[PDB]
Amino acid sequence: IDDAEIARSIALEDIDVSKPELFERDGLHPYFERLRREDPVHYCKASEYGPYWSITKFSDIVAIDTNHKVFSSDHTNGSFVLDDTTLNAVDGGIYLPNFLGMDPPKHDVHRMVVSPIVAPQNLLRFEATIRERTKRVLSELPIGEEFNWVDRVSIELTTMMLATLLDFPFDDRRKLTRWSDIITTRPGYGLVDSWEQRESELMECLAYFQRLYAERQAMPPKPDLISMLAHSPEMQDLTPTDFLGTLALLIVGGNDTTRSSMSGSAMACHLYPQEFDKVRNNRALLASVIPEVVRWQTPIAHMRRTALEDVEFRGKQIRKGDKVVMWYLSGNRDDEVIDRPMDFIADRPRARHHLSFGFGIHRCLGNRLAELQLKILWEEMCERYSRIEVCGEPVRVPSNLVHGYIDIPVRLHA
Ligand code: HEM
């Protein structure tokens, strides 16, 4: 398929950027280029998820994200992703309510329970712990033999990081990757064969975490996420559904995003070897490289809202009940705000000014944890490797939400 030809040729009204097939072949940029130029607040009438608004420009996306009283995230209105099966009991899905899918006032009550995980002193302890654990993984990677970087680096380090945050048994940490993966999938997408199989694996997740929760309730408070839920007065009446929904948020939130950033790091070093060379020669560039990895990869391609009011936005009449989608993958390529945004630039000015963590009351809680783990990985790459070679076909995730990789064949050079 030639996405450039279609995007030039078809009527504006027939553009649907939501198809997971487009993400699998990273074919979105010709469509987004046309929408940002010709119709930046665009109504799509025909899609699998019903009709929706696409918000494609940087400034416009900030406006939606920061107006939570007009543009709702609440689970009672359908929650915060475009595909209604991921978090609602519809068409084979199950109900997964959580504080990212809550509007105020309840949102703030739940966020405050887990916000100590990024207290300053915990970030310092976390950084010291991660450093040694990361060193140990990287020092066993072969030189001059092909391996899947997603398997040996992205998953290996990400599941070690999330296990540290949950104090999850280290020997079972592969379960965290499995549970994360099935939350954002559908039957036939290559992970589960049925909705029922998905439901079974999530009940197994619930049973495992319930055992851990009961253990944490009976020991002193510790700086781990399950401990924080287990000792919180305001969390004592979670229904089974709310508990499972909250676990889903913490498992996917810390897993899929960081994994995708680690996979993008390898792609960046191969496609832009001179930028890797720069930071290797000058380690002060880590400050600008890490936010740029996250902007360039954009691990979460969109977040979705539902309008609670009729509202005229940039000249367009949004109606109460309409789906509104913030395309972070488009916004992070808006050259009104970001110069030469298709390329990876180790040394970019105002490198923290990107959309990948959102803006407003739902801005990513764990952004400092991700950035510290990515810093430590780049420190180690810089010390151990002359270059990172992608030597076979990359295989991408079929999702309009998770913007990441299944397979990146690499060879390391020293
Ligand atoms: C590069 C890594 C990451 C990216 C790109 C990312 C992206 C996001 C985005 C896009 C949101 C929603 C923003 C909005 O709607 O305005 C979010 C929220 C959240 N993230 Fe992250 N995230 C990352 C790492 C992490 C990690 C490591 C954790 C936990 C250990 C985490 C936990 C959360 C939580 C709990 C929320 C909900 C905040 C709320 O509703 O108040 N994230 N993240």
TrEMBL record:
Pfam families recorded: p450
One Gene Ontology molecular-function label: heme binding
Keyword Iron: yes
Swiss-Prot/TrEMBL cofactor(s): heme
Keywords: Heme, Iron, Metal-binding, Monooxygenase, Oxidoreductase
PROSITE patterns: CYTOCHROME_P450
SUPFAM superfamilies: Cytochrome P450
PANTHER family (alphabetical): CYTOCHROME P450 YJIB-RELATED (PTHR46696:SF1), P450, PUTATIVE (EUROFUNG)-RELATED (PTHR46696)
Family per record: Belongs to the cytochrome P450 family.
Protein name: Cytochrome P450
Taxonomic classification: Bacteria, Pseudomonadati, Pseudomonadota, Gammaproteobacteria, Pseudomonadales
